[PDB]
Amino acid sequence: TMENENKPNVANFEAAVAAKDYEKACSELLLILSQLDSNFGGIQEIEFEYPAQLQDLEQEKIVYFCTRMATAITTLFSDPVLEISDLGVQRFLVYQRWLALIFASSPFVNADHILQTYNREPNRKNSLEIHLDSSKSSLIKFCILYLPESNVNLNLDVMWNISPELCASLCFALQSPRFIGTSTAFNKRATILQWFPRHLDQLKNLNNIPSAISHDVYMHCSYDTSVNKHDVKRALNHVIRRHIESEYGWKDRDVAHIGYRNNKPVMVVLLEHFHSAHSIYRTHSTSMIAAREHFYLIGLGSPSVDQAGQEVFDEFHLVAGDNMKQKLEFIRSVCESNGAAIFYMPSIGMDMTTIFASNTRLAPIQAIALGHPATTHSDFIEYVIVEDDYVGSEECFSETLLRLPKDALPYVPSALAPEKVDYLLRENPEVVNIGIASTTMKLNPYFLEALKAIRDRAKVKVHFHFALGQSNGITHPYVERFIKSYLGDSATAHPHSPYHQYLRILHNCDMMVNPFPFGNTNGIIDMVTLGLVGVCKTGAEVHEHIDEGLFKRLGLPEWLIANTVDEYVERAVRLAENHQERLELRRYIIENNGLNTLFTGDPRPMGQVFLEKLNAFLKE
Numbered sequence: 243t244m245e246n247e248n249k250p251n252v253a254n255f256e257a258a259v260a261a262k263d264y265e266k267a268c269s270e271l272l273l274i275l276s277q278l279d280s281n282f283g284g285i286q287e288i289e290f291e292y293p294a295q296l297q298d299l300e301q302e303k304i305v306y307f308c309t310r311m312a313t314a315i316t317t318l319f320s321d322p323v324l325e326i327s328d329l330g331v332q333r334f335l336v337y338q339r340w341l342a343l344i345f346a347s348s349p350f351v352n353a354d355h356i357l358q359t360y361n362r363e364p365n366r367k368n369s370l371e372i373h374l375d376s377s378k379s380s381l382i383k384f385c386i387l388y389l390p391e392s393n394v395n396l397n398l399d400v401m402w403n404i405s406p407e408l409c410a411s412l413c414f415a416l417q418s419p420r421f422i423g424t425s426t427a428f429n430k431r432a433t434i435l436q437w438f439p440r441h442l443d444q445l446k447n448l449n450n451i452p453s454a455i456s457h458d459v460y461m462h463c464s465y466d467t468s469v470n471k472h473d474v475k476r477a478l479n480h481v482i483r484r485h486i487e488s489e490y491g492w493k494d495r496d497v498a499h500i501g502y503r504n505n506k507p508v509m510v511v512l513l514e515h516f517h518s519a520h521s522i523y524r525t526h527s528t529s530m531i532a533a534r535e536h537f538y539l540i541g542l543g544s545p546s547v548d549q550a551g552q553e554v555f556d557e558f559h560l561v562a563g564d565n566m567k568q569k570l571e572f573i574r575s576v577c578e579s580n581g582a583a584i585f586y587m588p589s590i591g592m593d594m595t596t597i598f599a600s601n602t603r604l605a606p607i608q609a610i611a612l613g614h615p616a617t618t619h620s621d622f623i624e625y626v627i628v629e630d631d632y633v634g635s636e637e638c639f640s641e642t643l644l645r646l647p648k649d650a651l652p653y654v655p656s657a658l659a660p661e662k663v664d665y666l667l668r669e670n671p672e673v674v675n676i677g678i679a680s681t682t683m684k685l686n687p688y689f690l691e692a693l694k695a696i697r698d699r700a701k702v703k704v705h706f707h708f709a710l711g712q713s714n715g716i717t718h719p720y721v722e723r724f725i726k727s728y729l730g731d732s733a734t735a736h737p738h739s740p741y742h743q744y745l746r747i748l749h750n751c752d753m754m755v756n757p758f759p760f761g762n763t764n765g766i767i768d769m770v771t772l773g774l775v776g777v778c779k780t781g782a783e784v785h786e787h788i789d790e791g792l793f794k795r796l797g798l799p800e801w802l803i804a805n806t807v808d809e810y811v812e813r814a815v816r817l818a819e820n821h822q823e824r825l826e827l828r829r830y831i832i833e834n835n836g837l838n839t840l841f842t843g844d845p846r847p848m849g850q851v852f853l854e855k856l857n858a859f860l861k862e
């Protein structure tokens with residue numbers, strides 16, 4: 243060992259590339275990509291120097307970073323001699339999304355200029371097709387640099403014949419970014435969603451694909467617009483099921499007998515991201531608290547859960563184990579010694595543990611809620627807790643929906659909610675400012691085309707303020723370019739901001755519009771809090787339908803809830819042109835709104851319902 247061997251360092255990566263030491267370059271580069279991973283795209287704790295002019299100019303400092311990184315990556319991967327260790331390949335595909343961002347936030351856009359150096363057939367006959375030598379090594383390198391923004395052609399069928407596993411690693415990488423919003427990237431991912439599932443279903447386990455981003459593959463499909471977007475989850479479940487049987491020798495429990503604690507049957511709840519300042523606790527703690535009239539509750543989670551989270555349950559334990567095989571054995575053992583009636587996950591999708599767990603048989607009733615609002619397509623999960631007013635069509639879900647009364651999941655209000663108001667109802671707007679509260683995953687070309695439509699068509703000048711949740715570090719310059727490609731001067735791409743500052747941006751707006759197809763929830767509450775009204779578009783999936791449910795609970799009029807893009811655009815424009823209508827409605831909403839009603843209700847049903855379903859299991 244040497245001191246400072248493992249510090250991500252842009253100058254040391256560059257020097258290793260100039261010195262043609264391909265091994266040190268790779269490893270120095272992987273250190274940087276790994277850090278970008280940990281930092282969620284931020285560049286803190288990566289060492290680099292910059293021209294003084296950039297000191298206070300952070301976006302410009304980030305673009306400078308990505309530019310240095312893309313030039314050094316270009317030299318390195320353009321060199322015909324470079325050969326990547328097969329360990330190395332697996333790491334590069336796992337970090338692909340970070341290279342994607344390196345290039346997309348630089349002026350290069352993508353790494354096609356590297357790709358073109360790999361062409362061998364001076365014919366072409368389409369210069370967007372790249373004909374490689376037959377070296378396995380060249381196929382690899384191509385894949386690593388086949389970015390979501392790539393313009394080069396890709397034929398998946400031929401690909402998957404040559405190497406199934408390489409090709410499934412690509413599909414993973416290309417599904418894993420938290421921003422897939424441009425036309426080029428989105429279209430690519432859409433293709434994968436139709437093509438990849440039936441191919442992944444043929445896979446045997448997780449050994450030679452990038453498994454550390456399966457949770458990302460699992461969640462991100464929800465942000466596409468197709469009806470059958472979740473098919474990849476069904477496939478992914480089978481491979482995980484095969485994995486845990488084959489690599490772990492997993493055995494399901496005998497769930498014919500249940501045990502008892504303080505004379506009640508046992509609900510074991512496996513938790514993801516359940517801190518009391520966060521939305522899972524805000525939406526699901528009270529229903530879990532009330533479930534204690536009928537069940538003893540055991541909470542399994544991470545040390546990230548705070549005292550208020552732990553107090554929801556009768557008993558709380560850390561999920562122990564050094565790997566997945568162990569954590570599962572641990573979870574199994576808790577269910578065994580207690581003899582679980584219920585296995586429940588309020589959220590599934592954010593951590594890989596919950597995903598694995600949902601492919602096992604641990605209790606006779608196994609059920610989830612929609613903290614991540616999408617069907618599991620797992621045959622091991624029977625029920626889905628959901629508020630009746632949030633369901634669109636029941637056929638979006640493979641599981642049976644347990645539709646609970648619309649006041650059955652009262653929310654815990656945020657401690658950050660301002661106590662005082664200051665409504666700004668602008669009588670004279672030259673400009674209509676229209677806010678949009680969003681994460682990067684919610685952004686897409688259909689949403690942004692709808693927004694360009696509202697801008698082009700409205701007879702009033704409009705300005706769009708995007709308050710982008712978690713837009714950040716090297717992701718952000720790329721997002722701003724995407725937004726500007728549609729709206730130019732009619733839009734401001736605000737990066738992630740603290741709560742009071744985020745509230746200040748919206749407070750300067752006249753109305754809001756909601757993203758589709760995956761809408762807001764918390765955005766809507768902040769909207770009404772500020773006395774604002776907006777448009778949302780509804781649809782069949784819960785994540786499309788929530789906004790409708792929520793608009794009705796809060797007392798917003800149905801004309802605000804559009805069924806199609808063309809209506810969405812239409813109502814948005816109407817809200818923007820019709821000043822006095824818009825203001826009357828703001829005044830109506832300031833005056834009488836169900837904000838109150840979100841925080842109260844009867845949380846008992848969930849427990850009640852699990853009891854009946856359990857009692858009926860105990861007769862048979």
Ligand SMILES: O=c1ccn([C@@H]2O[C@H](COP(=O)(O)OP(=O)(O)O)[C@@H](O)[C@H]2O)c(=O)[nH]1
Nearest residue numbers: 709710711738739740741744762763764765
């Ligand atoms: O710049 C921002 C953007 C968002 N948020 C907070 O994060 C929430 C949005 O989170 P998300 O879209 O992931 O889930 P949602 O709660 O909308 O269902 C908002 O309510 C804000 O309270 C914030 O503080 N600053």
